[PDB]
Amino acid sequence: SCPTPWTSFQSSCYFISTGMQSWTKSQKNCSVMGADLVVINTREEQDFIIQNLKRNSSYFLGLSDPGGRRHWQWVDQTPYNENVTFWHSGEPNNLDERCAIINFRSEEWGWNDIHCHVPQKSICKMKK
Amino acid sequence: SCPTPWTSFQSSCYFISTGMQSWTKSQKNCSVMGADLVVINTREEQDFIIQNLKRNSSYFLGLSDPGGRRHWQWVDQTPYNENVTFWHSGEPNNLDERCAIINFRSEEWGWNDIHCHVPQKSICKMKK
Secondary structure, eight states: OOOTTOEEETTEEEEEOOSOBOHHHHHHHHHHTTOEEOOOOSHHHHHHHHHTSOTTOOEEEEEEEOOBSOOOEETTOOOOOTTSOOBOTTOSOOBOOEEEEEEEEOOEEEEEEEOTTSOBEEEEEEEO | OOOTTSEEETTEEEEEOOSOBOHHHHHHHHHTTTOEEOOOOSHHHHHHHHHTOOTTOOEEEEEEEOOBSOOOEETTOOOOOTTSOOBOTTOSOOBOOEEEEEEEEOOEEEEEEEETTSOBEEEEEEEO
């Protein structure tokens, strides 16, 4: 079964961080223990997780938008080909990265999207 | 065989607007003429279009990012299923609509990306 302070559910092991770090640092921390920031596949998983969280805490999930390139589309559905474009220097603007957190509102538990560099606690998951 | 005010290049007909309208209204104006906002497929096409433009003007192209929902990704590549999510009400934040324009910098001609609601001139294209 699951290692030392990890919590077991179905075929997975869950770790709850006490430290507040960026999403990237949170992912690295999970990674070093052989895990990932939590991927929530089902309602039942969501429910298990929230029972193991504290209402006075807020946590990164393993859900993000890496930003960068926008998904440019031609209006007639011609596929966008980045190698045949004529953007001025400095253009186009990159999409900002976004990161999901889970936390409690008086609505109860749910996800919110925030800037990835804001420090939050975090939740790791790996296979048992 | 492009009708009077339309200009002819390869197998296409091009119309240069005088009016300044949102991207969406600009597309509708092209559309009711049997056309679309211009889709630029090659360097030759870019070059032709430039010949028909005024350097004191800036024009919508038929290239956009229709915004809406971010391309959320689970960190272990599990596909995002929008029907198994637990966003708090009013979350996540919608992505803004972005649209390409073509204009002149003294760099010369190139594309910029702006918000789709700002009125600009426009370029329509249709098959010959």
